From TrEMBL, chains A, B:
PROSITE patterns on file: GLYCOSYL_HYDROL_F3 (PS00775)
Recorded catalytic activity of this chain's protein: Hydrolysis of terminal, non-reducing beta-D-glucosyl residues with release of beta-D-glucose
Binding locations of Mg(2+): D648, T650
InterPro entries, sorted: Cellulose_Degrad_GH3 (IPR051915), Fn3-like (IPR026891), GH (IPR017853), Glyco_hydro_3_AS (IPR019800), Glyco_hydro_3_C (IPR002772), Glyco_hydro_3_C_sf (IPR036881), Glyco_hydro_3_N (IPR001764), Glyco_hydro_3_N_sf (IPR036962)
Keyword Metal-binding: yes
This protein's record includes keyword ATP-binding: no
Keyword line: Glycosidase, Hydrolase, Metal-binding, Signal
Name of the protein: beta-glucosidase
Coiled coil location: none
The species this protein was found in: Listeria innocua serovar 6a (strain ATCC BAA-680 / CLIP 11262)
SMART domains found in the cross-reference section: Fn3_like
GO terms (BP aspect): glucan catabolic process
Family: Belongs to the glycosyl hydrolase 3 family.
Domain Fibronectin type III-like, residue spans: 640-709
Length: 724, 724
């Protein structure tokens, strides 16, 4: 409906109606829900919620199905005085019912279109079950694999994260200005603003601290890119930002998000974060929490009651302007209008059962394709892989038969629809003998059974991994290792004298040195989702050819953290030339290098790259155009990820040794050759200075073209002169 | 001499003379040295140094003895045109020839007077060998025991560090305005400005980053306290501070150090740090390095040549003001005048051999006393300790006979004068049987020998530890554990069925859970210095009673780092109540608590404390006066460390759960009772806000009185009203 009519609604609402519009609740706190009704009475009483609250609530969080939504919405519109529909929001993180790989695995794809497709299918399915908003993408930069939430990020590089962030928004939303018409697309909500990934010691919800310049340089760019691409909502973070909980941080949310980033949508709190500023010790009570959160421009309080119980008295007593409340309500109403809820509150569902769109075979093919783009081949000694379909396989370990392959942050997908490793392999391989072991134990009996199976077969597929519950939210590990029983299992299998491929399933970087040394091949599958076993079988048999690259560094050991490719040089860098000396930046007990670096991954193919002549000089403001010819010089079709990095050799701030500024994943048949071109705009050459200005300085840059952050040719470009 | 005459010298100097005044060199780069003279020609050529450079150099770094000094200074004053004497500077970190405990161990003393004495004796001896300046105290706050340089800090608390930092300045300098008369005292140089201890991943020289507010709140206060107490010099740090290498950080060194902290002495570079800004990528070349370092106010370049080879051209071309040079030269001359060098350039030595004053028995008694104050008794199950002098002792392990007990940063002390553990024990105990093992191995032959010795005796003294070379500068360990052979040794010794005391010698916090669990008692000796074996024997026999408390947290495991007592609460704290739930700040695999906390330490005595009635309310600006009565309720004389912490419950910045604000180490005879009083001024109640103002806010504080950061009684005080 027209804007005038939206403003009209705001004027017509009572104060109590406006306050409750800023509250989000679980579905079973509403009448008309069709699940968990036994939770409703107790919990309404505990939150001290009344009908006047729930009949005017603004939003539902985590509806369980289309029927739940329809029922809740129908009952609510019966009794709502002005006919304002609820908006329904959900966590669709890496798929709805068709589960795609976890985001960190999608990071390893280096493939924008893979990520857009995941987001499209997610929305197709989620809208079919009546969800309007997804709490994705998660764009927290991560340098610390202790933190369980790395699984939800695309990794340690802001440029990659920004690019795949944009891809996800485009896939969920399509043309954002048509979300009232395109009812198979949904609103995206960027999270968690800001810098949540820098949690001290990888500990969940823990202190975050960095300079404002670093915040702007590394931690903000990905949220900013997704906002500029049209993300409709933003969610606050649990952590402090320079000492102030993000949720009531007026500088962060008013000056930066609403001011500088020009964000004019709904700012929704993370779960309970408005009430938690009390625990943080920056509000005395819920009256203060409410006041400060509203000052900071939080429109929507998720599942706490600070707003509903305190706003009235704050507005009555004059501590808080009613104008701040009206602008929140107006943003909530504009969101609903943007989704077409005032013309169709059932968002396409009321006379249209869209069950048919959920968990289709076409969608499964897409998740499989996503799986095979995202996996990373870390070792393959002696061309052990791909296996022949006649290879006789002993398939052993805790991930042999585990149905736990869908990943963390899988709120709607079901393990029964998932394909485990055994099932996947037996579709492809005629002889498989299986010995499943426990996640945290290695018994004598297991060793006997494993030994017997390996004696029978020709090659071992050792399937190791984490339970998904060892990561995700509030799954912090001080030591980033598998249970020791799995390292013992790999050591045992090695002694049997048969070639061993390790297929590793996990949600974070781990200490894998002992796995690489105990096997001939090592494949990082992460958690591929619904098609897990087929993803694995096709990569092992060569039906698909591994093409993923690490989007996060794999530490030598836990105490190397944080280690990441885009690091500063320091004043005493270790060089090939000073190897050995005491007074240089090094550890006495490990290498400075991570075990595996950013952008690293193997292939069954072999490629050669050639960069065309680059200029020696460039004007300020000028783009550098980078042409690369790549040839598949093997007999196997495959894909390579061309990566381009820039370094600022001398600057007024000590700049990273490399930063990724472009990438493209190129598919090549045997013998095929292609040319791709990149444009590094003058923004790629810029950075934040000690004064927090985005600047471009004259001087020397190096340009790295290659297939990892380490496997590169280097070129020099002197920037100066006049500005374009 | 008169200030006017000092100025006169500056006017009389040529440009080349002024430039060279800002250079510091090793002694064997001068004519007249009496050691390492064969290094002189090659190195002079490599640095491309001439006589005109060395005959006008401003300072000598690391003279080897009084004779080296006298010789160098005598030859130099022969040829120097205006008669400006050299100033001689050295690393006297925890003693000269009489070696005291490493600073981190001195932290654990919680004893201001112990620290002042160490500093007094250090200066007595160092001045006797002709040094004018010491590069101490090191006041870098440390939260990361991977970093080898934690040994040189007093630990994780800014208040403790500030207080002992002041004690060290007073001990070295005495009345700073009389350093021309008191020739047994010497100038102190505060280091490393600033925040060097926050090196990322505990990696030497590595990136430092934190908000400016945190910089002020936690990282600056100890340098500031030592500057205000009258420290004559400051040394720059190796690291970046918000992206700019400290050495050329104009904001840091001009605005903060010279402006806000009102420091008007010599700013000396850390070793090579002026040249190393090039490596950091914030200067293109040595011409830029010089220009920027001088702009930032660095007066004295340590052992690099940027200044001498580039200042002339910078001044000639007008890229740098000659006035900046003259003020550096004037600060250098004022330092020399403060030390009386213009009346006596040999600073008391020329007709007075003070060999007499070095390594006296009185001094040894003081280092022993320091040792016994600083050790920390971590476990003592079943009153194993103290041992009777008739106890028959198996003394085993790598520290049984090792002479490596003087600590890191022992530039002048000699192992032959040290007392090892065996020697110390046999002065006290009639029966000791010794089995020495290696630091990194545990052989079958060792086990047989250990077994035989333990069977013969009644109690095991298991002496475990680090070589000093595993810490100090550029001794970063990614995993903070002893060599695994020592853990295996402790496990083996435990199976022998005899009571075990572990005496642990080390320069950092270590993972000691496996030691505490494998023994009945555990004594943390750190590196006590020259009197090590006697420090150990006296504590073991009860001749002295352990009284140290930890000045740094001991992590459950490496991946808990950083862990520290003064932490933020977060938005989802673990409580007694919610412990068990998923969605709280916790690790899946370890406790949140460190293994041992700040301020923790045992005693052979037992004490009780009672805090007198506190007010319920306080005005802004008002001091809180805290009276504590402590009684020794045992039959053993000993010392307790009374600690007082404050918390700011609610603030505009999320404030730590506790901060130490006072402490006193109280000595009590059996049955004795004392009353001590503390004043927590309104500055103890203050903090830096989001705008970097030092503020006091009205509201609730809690006051904790006790004997650790955990063992405390808690009291509430409501601050508000008017201001004093
Ligand atoms: O689910 C919406 C957003 O909120 C958080 O998940 C909450 C968690 O913080 C809370 O403790 C539990 C209690 O039931 O529910 C979860 O829903 C996540 O941190 C957000 O990413 C999520 O989008
Ligand atoms: O000793 C003067 C100051 O120098 C640094 O020590 C240097 C070290 O950086 C350099 O690598 C070696 C070269 O041999 O000399 C050492 O003396 C220390 O970090 C400062 O704390 C010290 O006060
Ligand atoms: Mg540059
Ligand atoms: Mg307060």
């Amino acid at each position: 409906m027209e804007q005038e009519k939206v403003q009209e609604l705001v004027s017509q609402m009572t104060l109590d109606e406006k306050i409750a519009q800023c509250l989000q609740l679980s579905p079973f706190l509403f009448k008309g829900t069709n699940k968990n009704a036994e939770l409703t009475g107790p919990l309404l009483q505990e939150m001290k919620l009344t009908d006047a609250h729930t009949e005017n609530a603004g939003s539902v969080l985590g509806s369980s199905s289309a029927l739940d939504m329809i029922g809740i919405q129908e009952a609510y519109l019966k009794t709502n005085r002005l006919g304002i529909p609820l908006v329904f929001m959900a966590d669709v993180i890496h798929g709805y019912k068709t589960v795609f790989p976890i985001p960190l695995a999608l990071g390893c794809s280096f493939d924008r279109e893979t990520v857009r497709v995941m987001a499209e299918v997610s929305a197709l399915e989620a809208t079919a079950d009546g969800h309007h908003v997804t709490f994705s993408p998660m764009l927290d930069l991560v340098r610390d694999p202790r933190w369980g939430r790395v699984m939800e990020s695309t990794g340690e590089d802001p440029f990659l994260n920004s690019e795949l962030g944009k891809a996800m928004v485009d896939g969920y939303q399509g043309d954002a200005s048509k979300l009232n018409e395109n009812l198979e697309q949904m609103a995206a909500c960027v999270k968690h603003f800001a810098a949540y990934g820098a949690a001290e010691a990888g500990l969940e919800y823990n202190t975050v601290n960095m300079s404002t310049r670093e915040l702007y340089q590394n931690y903000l760019p990905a949220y900013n890119a997704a906002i500029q691409a049209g993300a409709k909502l933003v969610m606050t973070a649990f952590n402090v930002v320079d000492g102030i909980p993000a949720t009531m941080n007026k500088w962060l949310n008013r000056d930066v998000l609403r001011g500088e980033m020009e964000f004019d949508g709904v700012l929704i709190s993370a779960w309970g974060a408005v009430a938690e500023v009390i625990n943080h010790g920056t509000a005395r009570n819920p009256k203060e929490a409410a006041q400060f959160s509203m000052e900071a421009g939080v429109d929507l309080e998720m599942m706490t009651t600070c707003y509903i119980h305190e706003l009235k008295g704050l507005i009555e007593e004059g501590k808080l302007s009613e104008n701040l409340l009206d602008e929140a309500v107006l943003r909530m109403l504009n969101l609903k209008n943007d989704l077409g809820l005032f013309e169709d509150p059932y968002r396409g569902l009321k006379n249209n059962d869209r069950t048919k769109d959920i968990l289709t075979d076409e969608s499964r093919g897409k998740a499989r394709a996503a799986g095979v783009e995202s996996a990373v081949l870390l070792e393959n000694k002696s061309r052990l892989l791909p296996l022949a379909k006649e290879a006789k396989i002993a398939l052993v370990g805790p991930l042999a038969t585990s149905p736990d392959i869908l990943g963390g942050w899988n709120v709607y997908g079901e393990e029964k629809d998932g394909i485990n490793v055994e099932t996947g392999l037996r579709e492809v391989f005629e002889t498989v003998e299986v010995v499943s072991t426990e996640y945290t134990e290695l018994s004598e009996e297991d060793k006997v059974a494993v030994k017997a199976a390996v004696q029978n077969m020709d090659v071992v597929v050792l399937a190791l991994g984490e339970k998904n519950e060892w990561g995700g939210e509030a799954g912090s590990l001080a030591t980033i290792r598998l249970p020791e029983a799995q390292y013992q299992l790999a050591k045992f299998v090695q002694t049997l004298g048969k070639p061993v491929v390790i297929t590793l399933f996990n949600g974070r970087p781990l200490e894998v040195k002992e796995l690489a040394e105990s096997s001939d091949a090592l494949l990082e599958l992460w958690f591929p989702g619904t098609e897990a076993g087929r993803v694995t079988a096709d990569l092992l048999s060569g039906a698909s050819n591994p093409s993923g690259k690490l989007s996060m560094s794999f530490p030598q050991t836990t105490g190397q953290i944080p280690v990441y490719y885009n690091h500063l040089r320091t004043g005493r860098p270790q060089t090939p030339e000073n190897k050995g000396e005491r007074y240089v930046s090094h550890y006495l007990d490990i290498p400075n290098e991570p075990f595996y670096p950013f952008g690293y991954g193997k292939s069954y193919s072999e490629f050669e790259l050639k960069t065309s002549s680059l200029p020696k000089e460039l004007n300020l403001g000028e783009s550098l155009h980078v042409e690369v010819t790549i040839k598949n010089i093997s007999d196997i079709a495959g894909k390579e990820v061309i990566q381009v990095y820039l370094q600022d050799v001398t600057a007024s701030i000590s700049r990273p040794v490399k930063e990724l500024k472009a990438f493209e994943k190129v598919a090549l048949q045997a013998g095929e050759e292609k040319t791709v071109t990149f444009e590094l705009t003058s923004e790629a050459f810029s950075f934040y200075n000690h004064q927090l200005e985005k600047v471009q300085e004259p001087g020397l840059h190096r340009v790295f073209v290659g297939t990892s952050s380490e496997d590169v040719d280097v070129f020099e470009v002197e920037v100066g002169g006049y500005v374009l």
